[PDB]
Amino acid sequence: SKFRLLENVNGVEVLTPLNHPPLQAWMPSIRQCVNKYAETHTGDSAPVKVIATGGQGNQLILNYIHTLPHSNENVTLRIFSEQNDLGSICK
Structure with missing residues (x-):
């Protein structure tokens, strides 16, 4: 259950399990x-991290994790490589 840091994106740690296959693409x-998730989650409600998994086919799982007082905002989202609804999937 150890994570490696793919990238810090505007204060959000984008993490994946240590030995998960590559996700750079x-x-x-x-x-x-x-970016879009930040539009509906600011300040104390900004997520701490997002765990990225899957992505070896056309689907990626993103798990947004908030601080414990805001854990009711935690979400699992699924995005596709070809589809282009990130503005509405990632709110």
């Missing part, structure tokens, strides 16, 4: 998703 999508 998803980074532009992940960055857009984090």
Whole structure:
């Protein structure tokens, strides 16, 4: 259950399990998703981290984790490589 840091995106740690396969190809999508998620989650409600997994086919799982007082905002989201609804999937 140890994570490696793919990237810090505007204060949000984008993490993946230590030995998870490579995800670099998803980074532009992940960055857009984090950008859009920040639009509805600011200040104390900003997520601490997002765990990225999957992505070996056309689907990536992003788990946004908040501080404990804001853990009711934690979400698992699924994004596709081809589809382009990041503005509405990532709120």
